Structure formats: structure tokens, C-alpha cells
């Protein structure tokens, strides 16, 4: 039962990057006592672990050990502190050390790293790891002073081989009792043992567990070329996410935007590198982000000529709204990498853009408060979590396969569906981020970050951020929006957005279907009954009607008018009208989908007990004009019920009348712009429409369920 | 609520039912759910006999027969998993679970056809442990068992290094794992156990459509974890076969498991209410079968016959002369003289008497087969463990050998390949057959007629050495050349089978090892009793010493000796 106060952890870390902060928090959670070394001076060694370097740390350690060179009651611990997270308690560590009994315990890994020749001169152990790795040791102060005093070399020469050569001596080993944690009872390495680690969750802390020997390590040390797996492990161990306690360090380090001074600046940058659907809506939405428009700059780089008219249309309002504007046309023939590079460079040189919030144009931001939250989270890089609709695609990757391409992780499905909440850590984000300014100034000072490689800009960007030692967060607390599917997009029409009911249903509904439709479906009024067993409810909106009628007119071939038919299988119309069947325009299947989804429920909630499939055969647009043909004679229809929709205003574009119902002596005076008419049309409604006098009127018809 | 599910169970229903009748549980607190269909054989008759014989002692029995039809439409055969079969199994188990929730019953223990629940205290030891889904770890003959240790992406086996230190019982106590199939034990009082569901897959299901990957998902979604623990020995089950075998194959496999029970326990008695359809032993297509045994040794022989009729093999028994008890007056009466300049190759001792008796017994066997003029005969010993499909494979191999025709004299079936090196030459056009080498342990070998005549032409009546050393000389493979020079002619052509078909039951320095030979007195005098060697036994096993680049992959292997599924 050695006293838990005689333990002194010594690390080494020149700068203060984010990994060091992670280690400091993890060690503080258990109340260790960390005393750092070399905080401020320059890294006088070499590459971190590429081939060689790092003999300088032993020199600092020797210089420090003169202070404790006499003490006998203290147990010292040395762990390299850039990629280590402490997974356990001090008392357990001391107990395991004492039970080991020895005086100096090293960490054992499965590879002889610097040199190969002395593989055989080590002892023989049947089961556990064999060789030595100088990444971290624990022992008495006196032995460590005796063991570090013998260092006299260049400040650049390698470190680990010196410890190896020293330990290899038999007499020295027996004199000072140097042992290896063959079975990984205290030190665990994540190189060559990446198939024996499982996360053992617990009530309010997490902990790893080496299955092959069933021990619970203390110092996970993700050495070598496995910093990605350690980054993944950094979300949980030791208090990051606990199955009852929400998150861990996930709500602190918040500025709360104080001072009263206008909030810090921004340099927005919208990129449109594809032909993307619903572009004008996104452009209009850009005018609503909750940030005073006297600070947010802008930069809108198009790259496709087809999108020129929309930006040309919407330019002046953006010019007025924001404190500055700049465009780049499609004629510069700029590669996407060059464009992103230019944006980043333009924020790097200005000493004022405190942030940089890029945003691709394939990202619909439902929430209007994203910028405030992202600025508030106060981290070096961060994204929102946009997810495709009803699927698993999203903008991040659980893990990297050895090919540096996507390889699924074990908690990606449990992140996409928001069963866990926090600010995670991830090895690739894209399509929205908030890069802090100083990180762009004095921690990534080169220019070519996106381009400079055959690889696509996104992967090269994320690699160039991973390599420098900067985490790529991803915050998925609230609902931040949804992506758009632009995989296939037929742009050879008048208004291509109409054919978009099979790929982006939700935005289609938000834009085309009338705004009051949900209220009428839920049943809080609006739905009218001017005459018995006829229904008058709102379906379509102004945009859809205008664009549909414009497309129909652009088609032109207003066939029909003959009592005999070529379009009908029988070839004999009971009552000809000047019409165009939807089968001609290609709008057949989309209209069938509209009937199947947005109309069926309305009838199944209005005529109780009826179940419909919304199968249709006849559906058309008819044009009424006082010149060519007047209204229709009384008749009946070969369907269970019919759908009647008006397509333009009454009085502003035509003076006429609606429909008249004979058996009730019922008149329909004024059709509204977007609503619809529902009535049985087989037996009990002998109906006939009044004619029109001035202007022109179009109506929609569909004979559902023949 | 013991809930069987039988199909083509006629070969094994007696033994499993007998071992399921004796579960130490007051039989007024139990039930049954036998529900069988789609069976070629007469499973219906035997099950009805048993259930009607026992419908009194239990609490409340059930039944659901569907004898018609007699096969699935879109199936290849009796062992193919067509999706209709998966659907039917899922629905039937779901109906069983639903029937065990309306009777207000704690626990539901899902035995299956072949899972021989040997230990009587299985139910008590699972019940007294208080976990929601626990499932004892049944042994087998190979790696196969009834718990995984990790599913990769779509629910297929991924071995995790914490498997072997469980299946070999190097750790104990219940271990959280993500898969248990066959024999488990649900609970039905705990609150969370109202969401387990067999058939209707959980709406978030993405993986394949098996019948044990639709359960693990359900138990993961409802926050109950499947345990497995192995504090003692529980049962046995046979390894699943490929999807293209016949019903006789399954019968043989379960016979093999029954045989495996006998190595260290009394046999698995059949029940008393139903009777076993005794089979007709056959003579293997041979001339003779022999078995050396000692009159004093009574335990070994009984097990050996039990094994022999278990594979419908008759036996012509012979008596082995006690070399230990014999004295010089009759030892020299036959001119028995030890070979000049012979010692123990490993210890240095000259000779022993148990080996003398074994040599005399083999000599008499050779003389008898020579006198009667048999074409081919089979020899055994008193400690065996028969491998899978022993009779059929030996029959097919010898049929091939005889049809081809060659100078086979001392074909081997079990030995120890001490000369661990690069592989041996394979005899052309013959499968599973390789040329001989230096090897001890003449446990089982088929002595031919011409080979017997040559060996008797040797006259080894002036030279006594152990037969495991005597045989390699006669076909010119002994390393020491002085022994070869002491002999004259080397006309024997020994062969051997590369899938070895007979292993020793007990190894050296192991339990149940009492060597009749080795530990005895020297051929002369009567006061040198060489004790059984513990340290320098040097005959541990040629299986962990052979795990090197021995290869022998150039051989042609049978369509049989291929089995197993996702597990190995």
C-alpha cells in the first residue's frame, strides 16, 4: 500500500498542440501530478518517428534527475506525451507495479524498430511480446538516475537503441533488475496488437481491455503509424462518453460571445462546382443567416455556365445585404482546387477575418442558427453533421482503410441516427466547416493545400490537416440540415426542378406543394364543402402552377378537338376537348407519384373507411378560351372521383365561371389559384361547367381509380 | 419448458432423449413442445411411443405433426438450407416462444436433435446463475462449438484471439460474447425479455437472412447480452456437414460422437421406454480381424468391443501371452534369443518382457494367417480412438488399391512419423496413399499374404527387438546401418495412409496411461523393473511436433474427409 502521493509523472512536449491538451485532461481526471519538461524551447532533434531523432529528451531528463538523484521514497514515470491517454487510477497503477516487484519496467512491443541484428540476443518468452520499446517506463528514482547518468552523445542521435544496448547486457540487467511487461499488464501499445483491444463500457467511465491476456492496461500509447486509431479511441477513454452521462468535455470552453462589441468577423465562401438543384432557393436562404450583415463578407465562385442566370438575377440583393462581395466567373476556367486555394489565401493575408466558413452549394441548412453555434464551440476545425435523407450517407468517415479510402467503423451507424450526442473526433469532414483564423495564419502557412496532387481536393485537404497535428472535429448535437442528391440531373428542360420528385422529396414538397396543405390534412378547417359531397382543399402553390403552365405552353401542340381519337385505345371520345395528355410531356410518372403520395391520404381521411391506391389512366391539361371552344355539356365520368385544379387567377386573367351541379342546383363561382376540387363522378353528380367570356383559363383534371 | 425440434432424428433420438429424461428437476415443474415434420424416417413413430409412454409424469405435453409433405420443393436434398426452411424454422421457434409466454413459465430451454446433454445438472447450474440469455459450451471433435466471438459486417465468423483460451478451457466463468446458437436458455421473467423476437426481423435489419443472425440482432437491440460459460463438462454435439451429403452420413457422424463419449466416461445409456434398432454387424469385406488383448486387463477390452459393434464390426478375439510372467525355462524352449548388440534407442536398457509378449503374439498371428492362407487380415491393439467414417473410408481405399493392383504387403493405417522433414513420395494413381518411412507405434496395420510369407521367411527367432523397430528394417529405412547389416533381405514394400485413421487413446505422461509394456522387467534376471518414464518419456505426441512444413500436399484426397461450416 505505497502512498499515492509518491508518484510523479514526467512528460515532454515542446509546443502545446491539441494532443497535449487531451493527455493533460485525461491525466487530470484521476488527479495525477504532471510535471512537464522543455515547455517553450525548440525541438532540437529530428522527425518525430519517421526514421530517427529525439535523443534530446533523454538529455532533458538527465538534467532534471539531478534534483531527485538522492530520493528513495518516490516512484517516477516517464511517458511521451503527444499521443498518450491515461486509462486508469493511480492506486491501481502503484499496486500493479509493486506486485510486479521489479525496479524498472519497460513497455514491450512486437518489433525491433531501429535495428534488426540483435533480435536473437533478447531473452525468450513463450506468449507475450518479446522485444523492448523505450516509449515509457516506471521505476524508482535512484535506478533511473543510475540508468540515465551514462548518456554522452550528440543531441540528434537516436534514443531507443541506446536503451536497447544498455538493457541487452546480462550483468547490468541482473544488477539493476530491468524487466519487460511481456504480458502487457500496465503498458499497452497499439502497433501489432490492433486485433486484441475491446472497449469495456462502464457506468460512468470507459476502459480498454486486452482480450488475449485479459488485463486492463493503464497507458494506451498509440505509437508508430496508428495515430488514427488512437484518435478514434480519444472520444471515449476515460470520461469522454458514458452511457448515462451525455458527453464529457463537450459543453465547456464556450465563449458565450460576451463584450457587447459586434461578434467576430467571418469570411463566407459559397462554392457551386456542380449543376445543383434548387439553387435559387439556397441563394435566397443565404440572406437569412443570423449574423449582422455588416461583418460577413462573401465570395461566390461559380464554375458552370448553366447557373449563370440565377446568380445574375440574385446579385443585387446580395450586393446590398453584405458588407462586401466578390465573384469569379466560369470563363476563368479555374480548377476547383485553385478556387478553394484562392479563397483560403484571401483569408490568410487579411489580418482581420477571424474565421472562415466555407459552404458548398450542395448543402441545405435547415437550421438558421448554425453559424452562432459553430463559432461558439471554439475549436480549430469543426463541421456540422449534414445527413442525406433516410439513408446512411453523410459528410465524414468513421475510419481509413490502408488505401486512404472510406472504411466503415463500428459506431458510424450509431452516429448517423443521433443515438449519441457530442462533439466527436473524426479523420475527414467536408461540405461545411468553420476554420479558425490563427490556425490558418501560423499553423498551416503554405499555399497549395487543395491542389498539388492527382487526388481530389477534399481528400488532399483532409490529409494535409491530419499530417500537421490538428484534429478535425464534427458536432452533431442539434439538427443542422440535410444534403442534396445531385448524382443524376437532366438539365435539358425549361424548369428541370419539376422532375425532381424521386431524388429530393422533402425539398420538392417544401417548394412546390401549397404551404397550407399540412394544416388541411391534419383537419383544422380550411377544407370547404360548398355543396353536398364536394370538397375544396389546397394542393398546389403558385410556383408549381406557373412553371407547369409555362412548360405546357412551351410544348405548344394543343391537339384534340375531334370526336374521334388516336390517343385512346378505342379511338372514340365521348366528349372531345382541347387537351394535352401528360404522356406526351414525360410528366406522367411524376404526376402519378404526386397522386399516390399527396392526394391518397386526403381522401382516406375525408371519406372514412375507403382505401385507395391512386391508380390513374386519364390525366390532362385543358385550355378554355372564348374563341376556340366554350365549356362542356352535362355528362358523367368513368372514375370513382375526379380531381379538379385551377392553374391561374380568376378575374386577373379571365372572367368566367366554375362548375354547376345539376342535381343540387349548385354553382361554383370563383376558383382559387391553387386549390383542388373533389367529388364523386360516377353516378350521383350530373355536373356541367359554365363557359368563359374574357381571357383564358386552364384547369387540371385526373380520373383517379378507374 | 423444454422445447425440442426434431427432423431426421431417428438415428439419434434414443440417446438424446435418454439423457434428457434424467435432468435433475422435479418432473411436475416441466413441459414439452415436441414438434416435428418433413422427416423421411420413422421419427414420428418413436417420438409418439416415447411421449405417450411419458405423458403422465410431466406436467403438460404438446405436439404438432405435419408428416405431409415429405420434402421441400425448392431444395437440393436433406441437408440444403433453402430459404423456405429458414422461414419455417424461424416461424416455429417464434410460435414456441409465444406458447411459453401464455403458460406463465420461467425459462425456455431449447434443446435440438443431436445436442446430447450428458451432465444431469445442466438445468440447475444454468438456472442458479441469473443471466438473461445463457448457453453452455458443448464440446465437439474439432474446433466447432456453439458460440462465436465476433461478427464482422454482415454477421459472419471472425476469430478473435480470445477464442482458443476458452474452447480449450484455460479460463472459466461466464464471458460476454455476441453469439450463442443451438442449446441456450432464455429467461422469461425479467422485464427486458418482452422484446426478444424470432421471426419478424427488427425494422433496422440490414444483414443476410439466416436463422441465427436474426436473433443476435434482436438481442442486441433490446439490451440483453448473450453469455456462455464452461465451468465443467456439459455435453457433445456433432460438427455440421456440407450441404450435399446423405442421411447415412449424419447417422455415421452421430455414431462418431457417441463413440467419442466413451473415451473417458461410461457410455450414454439409451432411454428405457424406447428401444434401439439393433444393426447387423458386417465383416468389412475382409478375411479376418484380430485384436490383441490381455486377460488381466478387463476394462480396455469391453470398451473396444462396444466401439466395434458401434461401427457394426465383428471381431475374432485372440489372447496375448504374458511376457512378464514368463520365465527362462520356457523362454529358451522356443529358442528366443535377443538380437546381439541391441539396447534401448532412447534409454539404453537391453529389452523388456511386455515387448517380448507383444512380439510373440504378433508372431503367432502371422503364423496363423500363413497356415490358414488368408489373402488380407487386419490387426488392432488395446487402446484406440477411431476417426470419422473409419469403415467406409478404409473400404473405399482398399477397393481402389485392389482394383489397381500392386505389391502392397504391410499397408499402414496408424503410426508416428518421427522423420519430420520434406514430404514423402506419393504412389501414383492411388489416393490418400503415400510411401512408408521410419515410424514407431504399430497400432494398426493390414498384413497381407505375400508380406506375411516374406516376414516368416525372415526367421526372426534369433533376433528380438520391438516390432516398431523391427518393421522399418525389413523395408530398408532404418537409420542405423548395423541393424540392417545384421539382417539379410529387405523385400517388403510398406505403404501408409496420409489421413491417419487411428491415434493412441492416452499419450505419455497423461491421465489413464498404464503401459503394459515399457514398465516391466528385463528379458533376463528378475530384479530390474524399469519404472514408467515421466521425464524422458519422449513419446508425447507427433502432432504438435509435426506442425511445421511437413506439407504432403501433393496427395489426392477423397471426396469424403470434407465437412464443417462457419466455425473452422
Amino acid at each position: 500500500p505505497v502512498n499515492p502521493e509518491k508518484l510523479l509523472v514526467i512528460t515532454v512536449a515542446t509546443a502545446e498542440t491539441e494532443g497535449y491538451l487531451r493527455f493533460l485532461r485525461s491525466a487530470e481526471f484521476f488527479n495525477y501530478t504532471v510535471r512537464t519538461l522543455g515547455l517553450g524551447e525548440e525541438w532540437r532533434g529530428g522527425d518525430v518517428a519517421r526514421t530517427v531523432g529525439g535523443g534530446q529528451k533523454v538529455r532533458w531528463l538527465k538534467k532534471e534527475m539531478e534534483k531527485y538523484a538522492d530520493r528513495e521514497d518516490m516512484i517516477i514515470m516517464f511517458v511521451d506525451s503527444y499521443d498518450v491517454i491515461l486509462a486508469g487510477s493511480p492506486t491501481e497503477l502503484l499496486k500493479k507495479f509493486v506486485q510486479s516487484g521489479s525496479r524498472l519496467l519497460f513497455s514491450a512491443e512486437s518489433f525491433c524498430w531501429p535495428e534488426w541484428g540483435l533480435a536473437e540476443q533478447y531473452p525468450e518468452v513463450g506468449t507475450g511480446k518479446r522485444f523492448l520499446n523505450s516509449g515509457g517506463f516506471i521505476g524508482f528514482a535512484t535506478t533511473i538516475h543510475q540508468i540515465v547518468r551514462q548518456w554522452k552523445y550528440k543531441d540528434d542521435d537516436d534514443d531507443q537503441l541506446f536503451y536497447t544496448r544498455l538493457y541487452l547486457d546480462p550483468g547490468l540487467r541482473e544488477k539493476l533488475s530491468l524487466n519487460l511487461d511481456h504480458k502487457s499488464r500496465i503498458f499497452q501499445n497499439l502497433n501489432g496488437a490492433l486485433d486484441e483491444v475491446v472497449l469495456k463500457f462502464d457506468r460512468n467511465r470507459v476502459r480498454i481491455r486486452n482480450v488475449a491476456y485479459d488485463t486492463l492496461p493503464i497507458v494506451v500509447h498509440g505509437n508508430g503509424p496508428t495515430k488514427l486509431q488512437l484518435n478514434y479511441l480519444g472520444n471515449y477513454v476515460p470520461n469522454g462518453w458514458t452511457p448515462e452521462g451525455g458527453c464529457g468535455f463537450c459543453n465547456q470552453d464556450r465563449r458565450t460571445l460576451p463584450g457587447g462589441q459586434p461578434p467576430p468577423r467571418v469570411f463566407l465562401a459559397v462554392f457551386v462546382e456542380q449543376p445543383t438543384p434548387f439553387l435559387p432557393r439556397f441563394l435566397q436562404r443565404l440572406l437569412l443567416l443570423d449574423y449582422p450583415p455588416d461583418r460577413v463578407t462573401l465570395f461566390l465562385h461559380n464554375n458552370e455556365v448553366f447557373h449563370e442566370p440565377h446568380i445574375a438575377d440574385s446579385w443585387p440583393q446580395l450586393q446590398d445585404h453584405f458588407s462586401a462581395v466578390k465573384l469569379v466567373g466560369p470563363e476563368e476556367a479555374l480548377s476547383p482546387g485553385e478556387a478553394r486555394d484562392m479563397a483560403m489565401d484571401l483569408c490568410r493575408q487579411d489580418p482581420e477575418c477571424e474565421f472562415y466558413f466555407s459552404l458548398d452549394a450542395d448543402a441545405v441548412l435547415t437550421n438558421l442558427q448554425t453559424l452562432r453555434i459553430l463559432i461558439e464551440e471554439n475549436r480549430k476545425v469543426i463541421a456540422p453533421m449534414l445527413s442525406r435523407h433516410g439513408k446512411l450517407w453523410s459528410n465524414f468517415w468513421g475510419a481509413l482503410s490502408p488505401d486512404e479510402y472510406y472504411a466503415r467503423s463500428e459506431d458510424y451507424v450509431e452516429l448517423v441516427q443521433r443515438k449519441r450526442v457530442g462533439v466527436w473526433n473524426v479523420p475527414y469532414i467536408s461540405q461545411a466547416y468553420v476554420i479558425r483564423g490563427d490556425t490558418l495564419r501560423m499553423e498551416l502557412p503554405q499555399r497549395d493545400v487543395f491542389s498539388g496532387s492527382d487526388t481530389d481536393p477534399d481528400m488532399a485537404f483532409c490529409k494535409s490537416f491530419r499530417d500537421k497535428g490538428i484534429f478535425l472535429h464534427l458536432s452533431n448535437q442539434h439538427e443542422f440540415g440535410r444534403l442534396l442528391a445531385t448524382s443524376r440531373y437532366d438539365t435539358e428542360h425549361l424548369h428541370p426542378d419539376l422532375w425532381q420528385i424521386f431524388d429530393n422529396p422533402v425539398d420538392w414538397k417544401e417548394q412546390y406543394i401549397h404551404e397550407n396543405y399540412s394544416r388541411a390534412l391534419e383537419g383544422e378547417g380550411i377544407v370547404e364543402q360548398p355543396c353536398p359531397d364536394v370538397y375544396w382543399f389546397p394542393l398546389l402553390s403558385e410556383q408549381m402552377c406557373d412553371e407547369l403552365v409555362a412548360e405546357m405552353e412551351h410544348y405548344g401542340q394543343w391537339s384534340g378537338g375531334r370526336h374521334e381519337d388516336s390517343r385512346l385505345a378505342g379511338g372514340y371520345e365521348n366528349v372531345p376537348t382541347v387537351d394535352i395528355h401528360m404522356k406526351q410531356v414525360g410528366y406522367e410518372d411524376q404526376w402519378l407519384q404526386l397522386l399516390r403520395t399527396y392526394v391518397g391520404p386526403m381522401t382516406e381521411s375525408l371519406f372514412p373507411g375507403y382505401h385507395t391506391k391512386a391508380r390513374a389512366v386519364m390525366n390532362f391539361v385543358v385550355r378554355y378560351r372564348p374563341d376556340e371552344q366554350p365549356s362542356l355539356r352535362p355528362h358523367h365520368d368513368s372514375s370513382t372521383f375526379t380531381l379538379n385544379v385551377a392553374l391561374n387567377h380568376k378575374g386577373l386573367d379571365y372572367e368566367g365561371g366554375g362548375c354547376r351541379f345539376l342535381r343540387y342546383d349548385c354553382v361554383i363561382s370563383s376558383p382559387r389559384k391553387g386549390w383542388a376540387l373533389l367529388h364523386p363522378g360516377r353516378l350521383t353528380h350530373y355536373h356541367e361547367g359554365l363557359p368563359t367570356t374574357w381571357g383564358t383559363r386552364y384547369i387540371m383534371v385526373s380520373f383517379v381509380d378507374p | 419448458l423444454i422445447a425440442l425440434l426434431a427432423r431426421n432424428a431417428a438415428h439419434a433420438l434414443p440417446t438424446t432423449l435418454g439423457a434428457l429424461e434424467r435432468l435433475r428437476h422435479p418432473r411436475e415443474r416441466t413441459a414439452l413442445w415436441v414438434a416435428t415434420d418433413h422427416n423421411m424416417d420413422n421419427t414420428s413413430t418413436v417420438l409418439r411411443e416415447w411421449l405417450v409412454a411419458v405423458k403422465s409424469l410431466y406436467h403438460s405435453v404438446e405436439w404438432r405433426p405435419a408428416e405431409e409433405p415429405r420434402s421441400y420443393p425448392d431444395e437440393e436434398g436433406p441437408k440444403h438450407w433453402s430459404d423456405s426452411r429458414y422461414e419455417h424454422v424461424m416461424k416455429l421457434r417464434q410460435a414456441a416462444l409465444k406458447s411459453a409466454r401464455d403458460m406463465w413459465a420461467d425459462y425456455i430451454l431449447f434443446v435440438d436433435a443431436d445436442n446430447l446433454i450428458l451432465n444431469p445438472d445442466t438445468l440447475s447450474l444454468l438456472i442458479a446463475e441469473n443471466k438473461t440469455v445463457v448457453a453452455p459450451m458443448l464440446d465437439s471433435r474439432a474446433a466447432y462449438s456453439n458460440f462465436w466471438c465476433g461478427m464482422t459486417s454482415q454477421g459472419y465468423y471472425k476469430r478473435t484471439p480470445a477464442y482458443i483460451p476458452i474452447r480449450k478451457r484455460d479460463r472459466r466463468g461466464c464471458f460476454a460474447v455476441p453469439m450463442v446458437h443451438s442449446t441456450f436458455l432464455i429467461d422469461l421473467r425479467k422485464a427486458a425479455s418482452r422484446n426478444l423476437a424470432f421471426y419478424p426481423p427488427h425494422p433496422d435489419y440490414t444483414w443476410s437472412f439466416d436463422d441465427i443472425i436474426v436473433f443476435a440482432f434482436s438481442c442486441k437491440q433490446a439490451e440483453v447480452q448473450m453469455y456462455v460459460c464452461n465451468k465443467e463438462e456439459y455435453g457433445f454435439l456433432p460438427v455440421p456437414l456440407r450441404a450435399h451429403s446423405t442421411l447415412q452420413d449424419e447417422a455415421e457422424s452421430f455414431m462418431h460422437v457417441q463413440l467419442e463419449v466413451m473415451v473417458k466416461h461410461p457410455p450414454a445409456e439409451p432411454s428405457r421406454f424406447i428401444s434401439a434398432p439393433t444393426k447387423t454387424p458386417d465383416k468389412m469385406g475382409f478375411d479376418e480381424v484380430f485384436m490383441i488383448n490381455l486377460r488381466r486387463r478387463q476394462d480396455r477390452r469391453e470398451r473396444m468391443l462396444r466401439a466395434l459393434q458401434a461401427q457394426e464390426i465383428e471381431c475374432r478375439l485372440v489372447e496375448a501371452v504374458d511376457g512378464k510372467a514368463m520365465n527362462t525355462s520356457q523362454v529358451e524352449a522356443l529358442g528366443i534369443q535377443m538380437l546381439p548388440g541391441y539396447r534401448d534407442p532412447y534409454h539404453g536398457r537391453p529389452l523388456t518382457k511386455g515387448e517380448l509378449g507383444c512380439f510373440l503374439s504378433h508372431y503367432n498371428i502371422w503364423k496363423e494367417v500363413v497356415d490358414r492362407g488368408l489373402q488380407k487380415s487386419l490387426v488392432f491393439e488395446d487402446d484406440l480412438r477411431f476417426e470419422i467414417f473409419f469403415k467406409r473410408r478404409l473400404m473405399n481405399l482398399m477397393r481402389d488399391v485392389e482394383r489397381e493392383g500392386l505389391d502392397w504387403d504391410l499397408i499402414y493405417v496408424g503410426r508416428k512419423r518421427m522423420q519430420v522433414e520434406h514430404p514423402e513420395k506419393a504412389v501414383p494413381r492411388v489416393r490418400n496413399l503415400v510411401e512408408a518411412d521410419y515410424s514407431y507405434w504399430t497400432l494398426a496395420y493390414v498384413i497381407s499374404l505375400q508380406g506375411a510369407r516374406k516376414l516368416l521367411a525372415a526367421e526372426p527367432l534369433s533376433k528380438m527387438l520391438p516390432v516398431d523397430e523391427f518393421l522399418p528394417v525389413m523395408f530398408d529405412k532404418h537409420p542405423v546401418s548395423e541393424y540392417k547389416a545384421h539382417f539379410s533381405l529387405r523385400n517388403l514394400h510398406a505403404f501408409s495412409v496420409e489421413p491417419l485413421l487411428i491415434y493412441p487413446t492416452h499419450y505419455t505422461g497423461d491421465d489413464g496411461y498404464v503401459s503394459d509394456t515399457e514398465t516391466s522387467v528385463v528379458w533376463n534376471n528378475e530384479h530390474v523393473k524399469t519404472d514408467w518414464d515421466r521425464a524422458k518419456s519422449q513419446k508425447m505426441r507427433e502432432q504438435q511436433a509435426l506442425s511445421r512444413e511437413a506439407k504432403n500436399s501433393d496427395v489426392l484426397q477423397s471426396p469424403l474427409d470434407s465437412a464443417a461450416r462457419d466455425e473452422l
Binding site: 490492433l194 486485433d195 483491444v197 475491446v198 472497449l199 469495456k200 463500457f201 462502464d202 457506468r203 481491455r209 486509431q229 478514434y232 479511441l233 452511457p243 475510419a399 472504411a407 466503415r408 467503423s409 463500428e410 459506431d411 | 406463465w104 441469473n130 443471466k131 438473461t132 465476433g150 464482422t152 459486417s153 478473435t160 460476454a176 455476441p178 421473467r189 425479467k190 422485464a191 427486458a192 425479455s193 439490451e223 440483453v224 447480452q225
Partner: peptide, 19 residues
């Protein structure tokens, strides 16, 4: 496809006795 879990699942309370 790495780092499999050992999720924390406790023992749920017993259901109330029948009557």
C-alpha cells in the same frame, strides 16, 4: 471494421408476481 464494443447492459427488474 475495428474496435468492437462490450456495451453496458444491466439486469432489468423482475416482473411482478401473477395473481
Amino acid at each position: 471494421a475495428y474496435f468492437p464494443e462490450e456495451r453496458w447492459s444491466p439486469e432489468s427488474p423482475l416482473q411482478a408476481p401473477r395473481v
